[PDB]
Amino acid sequence: MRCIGISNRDFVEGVSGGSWVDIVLEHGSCVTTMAKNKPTLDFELIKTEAKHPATLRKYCIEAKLTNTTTASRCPTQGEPSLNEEQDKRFVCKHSMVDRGWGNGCGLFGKGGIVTCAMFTCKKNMEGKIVQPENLEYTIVITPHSGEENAVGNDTGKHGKEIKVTPQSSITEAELTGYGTVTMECSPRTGLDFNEMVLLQMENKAWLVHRQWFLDLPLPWLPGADTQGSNWIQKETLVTFKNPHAKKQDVVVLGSQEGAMHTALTGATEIQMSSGNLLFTGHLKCRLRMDKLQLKGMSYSMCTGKFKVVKEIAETQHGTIVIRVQYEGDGSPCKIPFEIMDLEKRHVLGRLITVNPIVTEKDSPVNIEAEPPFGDSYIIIGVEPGQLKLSWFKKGSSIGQMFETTMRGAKRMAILGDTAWDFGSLGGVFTSIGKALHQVFGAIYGAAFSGVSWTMKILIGVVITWIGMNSRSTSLSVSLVLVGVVTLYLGVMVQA
């Protein structure tokens, strides 16, 4: 019931022989899974946590210069010497100034000069790392129990919470009245945490790329540093000025907080203020339906009269949800719900809230269904007195197919070969497609890493034109396909 109301919602139907279904649990979305004679479940990844991160490097984003000193030597007499040059807390530079009789030299050449100032760091951009073993994932499983407040309720008071960690491959959640659900997740194969950094800068965090982070042009410290004064790339945060070949000076070159904020464009923000929480990424799990048993099975049908306590509302995915109350003698009974055609001779709509039941006479069970496109009747209750509600679903089967194709393409865009695990039930075609996707995705990621969407669009246009102007039919079609896929990805990348 928690998935009702969420825009990024996925319906998974069926379980493989052996009654397991493989689903991917992205952050910000959720998955509803339906199987014959199995309860409908709502799965949402609501929390990723990284524990005990290790500092990999501290960057300096705001410094200060003090104790500036200079030394000069007459022309041809070599370099000047400064005692501060020995210390690495001092950033120093050698240069030439005009010397002569006027400034105390017997010669009239370019005298060497050295300017040294002490570099002190005022703000840090610490970047931490996490081993995939300390990667607690949190999942909430809520059955489609039909409870009054269950629909779209993120409070989670009525949904079981399971923590997935690499230490235990199998997670068991007992759903009261629905048996036990078994998830076998792969916390190690989601975000590659051994190739990413938890970059924390002034009460903000970002999940960045390890190499990108190590390539940042700022003063830094190795991360194990304790004195915190031997900044390495200090020349990136200081200016040495010799305006007229007369005098050399050193300035500290501002604060780089805003520059870093601009540099972090394209990096997803995270919460490292307390706990290093991540609310991004996915988690591929294998769902075990073996021990899932419908609640309210072995109940008698409800023969009494039902009333609608909240009119039918249509969700964003073509499934309606209605709330009905019961007034009859057999309180714990199962609701006679059907979606017929206008003649009432064909059952057109499928029930998402499979096997609705009236647990309490006074409790307004709410239930979801997927009506067919066009006119239909929602019949609730048995004939003596029964609700007959008319519904019209806008759209089409062709439109739904197009939307499903677009959603699958988008899933293949955010995920790589992992899109082939979202609803797979074994399958030789699925495995072959995932392998081909792995190879093609390797080639594509190699050929397009570190490029913006505009460059991807330009490359796709160029490749499409090249294919269009190829006199080899095979190569022409292949190039056009590659170019169109590149254009689609460039359109769909970012955020």
Partner: protein, 75 residues
């Protein structure tokens, strides 16, 4: 500057929104447009150079686009 090395093409993008996706989606194209408006003269000469070098309109147009996109960048 760090601002010249953003985190865009790192290949870690999820369905979750990124740091400045809305803002930074068109910032570069806006910059190119503004630069081309403020410096028309380089645009005409880049068009002339592309037309001369490019033997086919595809080559000429591609060269002009690349020149115009790269001139503000180094700038």
């Amino acid at each position: 500057s760090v601002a010249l090395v953003p985190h865009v093409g790192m290949g870690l993008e999820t369905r979750t929104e990124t740091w400045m996706s809305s803002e930074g989606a068109w910032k570069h194209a806006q910059r190119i447009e503004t630069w081309v408006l403020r410096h028309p003269g380089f645009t005409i000469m880049a068009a002339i150079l592309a037309y001369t070098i490019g033997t086919t309109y595809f080559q000429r147009v591609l060269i002009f686009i690349l020149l115009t996109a790269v001139a503000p960048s180094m700038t």
